[PDB]
Design a protein around this ligand. Sequence first.
Ligand code: CL
Ligand code: CL
Ligand code: CL
Ligand code: CL
Ligand code: CL
Ligand code: CL
Lengths: 261, 263, 267, 257, 260, 267
Amino acid sequence: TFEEAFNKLLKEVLEFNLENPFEDAKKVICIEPHPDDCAIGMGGTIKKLSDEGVEVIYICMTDGYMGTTDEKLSGHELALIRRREEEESAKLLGVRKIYWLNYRDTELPYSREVRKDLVKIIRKEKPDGVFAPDPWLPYESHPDHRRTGFLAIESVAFSQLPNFSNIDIDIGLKPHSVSFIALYYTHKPNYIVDITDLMELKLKAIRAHRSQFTDDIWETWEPFLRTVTMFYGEKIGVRYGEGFRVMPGLFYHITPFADLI
Amino acid sequence: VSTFEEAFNKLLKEVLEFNLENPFEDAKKVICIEPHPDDCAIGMGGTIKKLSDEGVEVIYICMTDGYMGTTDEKLSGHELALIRRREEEESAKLLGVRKIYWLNYRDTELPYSREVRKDLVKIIRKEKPDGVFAPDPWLPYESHPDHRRTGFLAIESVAFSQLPNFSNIDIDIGLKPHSVSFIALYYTHKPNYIVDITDLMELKLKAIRAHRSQFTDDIWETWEPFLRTVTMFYGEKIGVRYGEGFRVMPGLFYHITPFADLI
Amino acid sequence: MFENVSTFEEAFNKLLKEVLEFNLENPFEDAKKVICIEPHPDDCAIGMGGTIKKLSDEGVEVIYICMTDGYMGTTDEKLSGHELALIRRREEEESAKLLGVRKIYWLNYRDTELPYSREVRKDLVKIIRKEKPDGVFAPDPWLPYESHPDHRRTGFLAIESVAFSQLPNFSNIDIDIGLKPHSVSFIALYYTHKPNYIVDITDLMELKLKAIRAHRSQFTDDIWETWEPFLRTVTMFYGEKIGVRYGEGFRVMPGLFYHITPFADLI
Amino acid sequence: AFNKLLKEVLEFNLENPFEDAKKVICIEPHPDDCAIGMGGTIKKLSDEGVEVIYICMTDGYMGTTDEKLSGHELALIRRREEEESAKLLGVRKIYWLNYRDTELPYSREVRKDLVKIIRKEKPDGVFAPDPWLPYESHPDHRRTGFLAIESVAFSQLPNFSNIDIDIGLKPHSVSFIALYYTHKPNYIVDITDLMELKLKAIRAHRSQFTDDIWETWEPFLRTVTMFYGEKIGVRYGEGFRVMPGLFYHITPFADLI
Amino acid sequence: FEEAFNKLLKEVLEFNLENPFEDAKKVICIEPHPDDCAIGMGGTIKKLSDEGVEVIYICMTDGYMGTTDEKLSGHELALIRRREEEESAKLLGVRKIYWLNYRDTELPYSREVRKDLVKIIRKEKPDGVFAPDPWLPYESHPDHRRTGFLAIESVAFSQLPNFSNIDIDIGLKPHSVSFIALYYTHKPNYIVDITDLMELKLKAIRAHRSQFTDDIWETWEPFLRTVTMFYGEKIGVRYGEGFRVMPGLFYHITPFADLI
Amino acid sequence: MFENVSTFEEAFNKLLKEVLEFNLENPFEDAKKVICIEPHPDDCAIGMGGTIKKLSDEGVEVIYICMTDGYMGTTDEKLSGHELALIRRREEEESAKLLGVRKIYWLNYRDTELPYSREVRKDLVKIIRKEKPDGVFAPDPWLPYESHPDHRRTGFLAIESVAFSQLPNFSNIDIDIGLKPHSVSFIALYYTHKPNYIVDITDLMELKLKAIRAHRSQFTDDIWETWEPFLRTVTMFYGEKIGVRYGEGFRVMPGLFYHITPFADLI
Ligand SMILES: [Cl-]
Ligand SMILES: [Cl-]
Ligand SMILES: [Cl-]
Ligand SMILES: [Cl-]
Ligand SMILES: [Cl-]
Ligand SMILES: [Cl-]
């Protein structure tokens, strides 16, 4: 039967588990489309990880240029404003190294050039685990978000190939095989992390981005963010959870039953 | 509050004040965004008549020139494009539309790019519509890239229309930001609002048929049944013979919302 | 027309049965020539190898289009992509001989760099119009969680290319030089999570795993320890659907269902 | 050594460089450019019954200042203008790339279109604009010139646009390239006789040459063809730059012929 | 031919080389980076402002890349450089600046960038546009060559209602500029004498502090004086700024364009 | 400053001699490490084979950057591009050994498909920052009538990437991973029509013709009765300028002259 084969493939051939995927790890990259996405999607989990003495590094794809409705606030000023804010925010969470790709907000390319930037940082830092948005989240209308999710996944895979971006090799950045990928802002989580006793810090980590979260905007966003973490919290029977989708690496390619975990 | 279901209910009713009962009721000006000449007529022809008849000003933006839409080996794309503009003029006349913006990107060649966003943003800023209609880019098995990109780009351009740093030369020359009230996505597998068009079906078909280059009698043998089947698909969801479906969601739902599928 | 049907279900059924003349009985029964489009060397074999053999045996002329050269598929730092592309061409010439395939078009886009553009559509179109195949097989570009841009793109470009092959204004220089418009009879999509037609391959399973292993550069002994169970498992996912040990699954739809059809998922 | 290479190792005829040509392709950016740049010479070659085929890169869509006239209608107009203009010159085949006026890409895709028409028609000569004309401000012109030269070279390479080879169209070696609209011609054609007819074939492009526009352009065109005439002591000329293939590449003394 | 040429220029085109900027009321100066207008034609900008010509800038890029300071992020440089251009503009009597905001080193060469320039030209209706000569020999900065070409292209395409047609549908109508003047040119045919404005120009350039430190100025002051002397000497003055102006015609299919 | 010069000629002389300290007697004199950038395999050897050997001999470390893979350089219908590129990699490894070159960076863009983009500048700038060379050699992109885009682009991109290698906001991830900005001392352009410095290669000519000839795929004998005559003529075009038999010509300029300098052609 298929069922026995599926069970055996997962337990005996792949050895993939969902009890804690995040355990073997002392270095991880958290990849974000915009300054503030790491905090919003997985702030809780970044602290929880900070404390185990996990080196948590960010890559931020874009500069946040466009994130204002203020006509006398230029894009260049805002980028500088949001750089501060993410440093303020990252300290609150225990992150101590941010890479800035500096692609303009709303103009993140979907290209080999961007994959190379991520490949270079991966091959350099050799993290055990990479986090990134789930690019298959229903109704996600931000291309910066979609593109981030796809390039993170492809870059993880390609970092392992020496014919991919072969100049890194020629200068002694060697192929690197990441251990796991964990996708946040996801509709299909299979691993939830409890953040009931870290919720308050996260909400604090998030309001540091003052440019994005004013008094008035925060009217809507506090409940929206309270609802979301409940949406996840309720899957494992706590108040506040953060959801991740973790799969076997094989399941990201030609796997007709990927949705069965 | 206690549970997710309560939170979710509180977020819709109170925080955003989200209602599906009557989302187009307040509109005064709408833009209907179409990949090719005929998509407004096919996708939402009855609703556009209803809107016009209520005195809503309905404006089209047509993304492409329909250059490819022929199997006639002696109808060149240019001649077809001219034929199809005259067909949309007549089609839009029947539905009471008086203004059409032609972007003129070649059929099958619609880019997915900042440049096309700026086109839509320009027109949105200038017209200041309360509502914008466009295809649903997540329609399953949709295989026309002009269709998917129209969906995506119309949704992106609505959001970007509000940001003064986005296409900043608009602002410098007098086109201020604009905040649209609603987006409604047609050609959708997931509607949450249905318009009864039973009384306007025959008019819809005549406005579609105005696209003569596209609908020969022979093709109409498959297409009338196809069109009736689709509107019955929609109609049946609110218990009427013929309907037109729309997906309308709060703005927040188009972004980082993992329970977006719960309306 | 279609005015005397009373319900959506009645209308859907009549549209399928009478207007579109669609069934999933034996979709491939009348195939004289088919093209199997694959992203990378080895894709047709893994995705639909059993079925290609079964078609070959019935005297169906089966032709590959291979989208990429496979340049990137090695962790061996001392193996260059050029050499690998040369190796993989020989592995496919040998896979294809096993399965009965006599012709391959190599588009040669570099592995991981397959563009999504009109220029690629034009290649696929030139060939489709040359060969005039009855059927075209390609990966399903909606496979959930499919993370390879080359796969997603081959799928979308296959479907689009099939459609645009019939348009004289698409790539009009093909027409000016004696390559007329062509109307393919069916598309079938492999590597699909929504198959609606399963081919029994229980018998030919061993010949299939051997057309696959022939891609030695991709399948060393230590990798086959994972890939053999994955492959058998995928094949019992499909066969189970029709209660056989081993199947290959395909999604087939009427051409109309690939455009503006909100009930396309009801087949 | 310059001479023991030109008229010895390569055999470079500047006396009558066309003459052996049975079939030639004229590549224009826009409808009308063939007639403007080399209409006199086109007629010459037709009268000698050499087969002259046009490839028009673009649709001429943007060529009007009339706010009432769509670019689609203009393209249809200019297509029939060109069919007429060509009828007057002995041209009985025009290939239409249908890239939009102002939007001609500079890419592999476009080289492929040209390479496909080259490999199918197996021309002896290709005519095209000189992409190095000083102060040429039209990107469609510059890019036509460069893509023409590059496609001619690439048509000879089987690994270039290889599907062409898979479906029957073989590699092809053009004999000569002739660049018109050139500041540096090394071959001039007396067209003093054909001049009233050149101006006729050009004027058939009614959309482009209103009586009022023609007030400026008749003098402009006459001045241009004199500029060429003067160089071989005739009244009306059309200039071409022809060089041996090799000079199109790493040749520091290219400007010496 | 010599007869034809003369007649064309003098009767048909009625082409002035005596004083081509005489009729100007509004001109746009198109610069690749903040400081190019001041560097390439800053004395002419002041001469024009003083005579009541409205001089408007279009700046193509943000100057994001113009620092060797590892701790100065490109965004901060851009903010700093807008402040600097506004200080520099004040001194030259320029009141309006359009910022395209394409990143320094990344200016596209595309229809999209043409549409920005066309929109501005349609809106502003200038009698003149100034831009770098895209054919300056040995020019190595892609942002400079492309401003050149794109300004020249945009000026011509601003007149075609099918080019960027949404402009016209929204009532930015087509517009025909009277002249183009190319600065940073090896081939000038009009020199303005700026001898008595030289000092003010050097001041307007130094307002771009981020770009002209003291050490840097040791090289650039002599460079700039050498360049104004190259031009000045052509009309027997100490310091000139050169421009190439041709008839619109000569920008296209004109094999004898190099005889002016 | 520069207020007491009286004419442009006086100003230009002083600017060259005193402010820029531009010397054309011995431009390469202080070289410890140079990079030679070539569009295709064989371009360094053809362009400057003699000079690279004169440099090697002196203990100058010469590093090659090859922009493309030479995929397209064949008329042989049964020789694929992949195999050609594998062949040319070894033709260049030999050719280089002959000239004393001990490192080659292969960017591996496909021949005829070298992009003119920020991405390629990033590759150059990566290698320049890593190697920290005193000098860079590249084809002169302004060669009149040069009709190969790969060649034009390589020269423009070389000149740009040398300027941009200095700027820490250009390709800022390099800086973040320990690759700092670098300032090359000189640029020398080969394949040039306007050289201002000629190297005598008369006693190295034979060795050059041989290192060129290691590119067997490119130079048959049919080809060579036409390409030895061509090369001997080119090296005499340069040699005759300094009255030796065979020379290699270069264009050298102060970095200032690569930007907004209307008197660039005066040197
Ligand atoms: Cl009937
Ligand atoms: Cl009927
Ligand atoms: Cl009937
Ligand atoms: Cl001092
Ligand atoms: Cl001093
Ligand atoms: Cl001083």
